[PDB]
Amino acid sequence: GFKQDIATLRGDLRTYAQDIFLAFLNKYPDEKRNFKNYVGKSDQELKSMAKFGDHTEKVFNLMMEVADRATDCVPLASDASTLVQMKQHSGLTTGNFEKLFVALVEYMRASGQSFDSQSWDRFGKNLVSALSSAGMK
Amino acid sequence: GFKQDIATLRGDLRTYAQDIFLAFLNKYPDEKRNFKNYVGKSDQELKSMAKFGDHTEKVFNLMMEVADRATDCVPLASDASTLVQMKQHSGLTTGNFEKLFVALVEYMRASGQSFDSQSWDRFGKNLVSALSSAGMK
Numbered sequence A, B: 001g002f003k004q005d006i007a008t009l010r011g012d013l014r015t016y017a018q019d020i021f022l023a024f025l026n027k028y029p030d031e032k033r034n035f036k037n038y039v040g041k042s043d044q045e046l047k048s049m050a051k052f053g054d055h056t057e058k059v060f061n062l063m064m065e066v067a068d069r070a071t072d073c074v075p076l077a078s079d080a081s082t083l084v085q086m087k088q089h090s091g092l093t094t095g096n097f098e099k100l101f102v103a104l105v106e107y108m109r110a111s112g113q114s115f116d117s118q119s120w121d122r123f124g125k126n127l128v129s130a131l132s133s134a135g136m137k
Ligand code: HEM
Pocket: A031, A034, A035, A054, A055, A058, A059, A060, A062, A063, A083, A088, A089, A092, A096, A097, A100
């Protein structure tokens, strides 16, 4: 279920973080406007940039924190507010996050593993709702 | 305290993992008999060897989960059993683990941050006792 999935992801977080983030960027190419340093690069090129693996793991570490602190796949309002207030997230809207979670759930469903994709889908929807309540447009 | 330290480490885990593991190898050079691929290499060389980074990060990914699952710095018996039974740990003894945690605690005390080094010292001792209970020599 959801708790085991957090453990699975954490066990090899670098690898999962990179592959889910690339799946997102390739599914929604316009989203790369937010990451101008990644423009014009294939997946293997990105993985050769030190900050790509580093920053992307750090993203997924925070995601796993928020997931683990959730109750029934509903994130804490305070965690949603952190995500809204981060300077690096200024100007994002909830649709950016919606798309990330669509890509994450699609990745899980295609992985041939045993992820609880339905829980992750709910978590993404509930995170979007929480971000809106915490003041994201 | 201990829970926050898990979060701190997880926020920059590959860097902490490599730096703590290097501190261990450099404090206890004979321990490199277990890691013959790492012989004859400076720290910077090891940090550009793919398996050194990838394996050491996976070690710390799991270590943080064992720490997170602990109660008052005492690990789950199931986690101790996993660490004893894993094929990669065959022929280790508890002294290997003792030394790793001595180095980790020393690293924390020298870091100039606010780690709860006493809790990590307890965790290392309690993990060793759990490994012995689970059948490690
Ligand atoms: C739950 C989802 C998300 C989490 C947990 C998250 C977390 C983070 C974290 C921890 C950082 C700092 C990384 C570092 O520099 O070490 C960061 C930076 C950033 N985030 Fe997010 N983020 C999320 C979703 C998004 C989405 C959906 C977008 C845009 C599509 C976005 C855009 C950015 C940008 C532009 C930066 C700064 C540039 C960069 O690090 O490459 N984030 N995010």
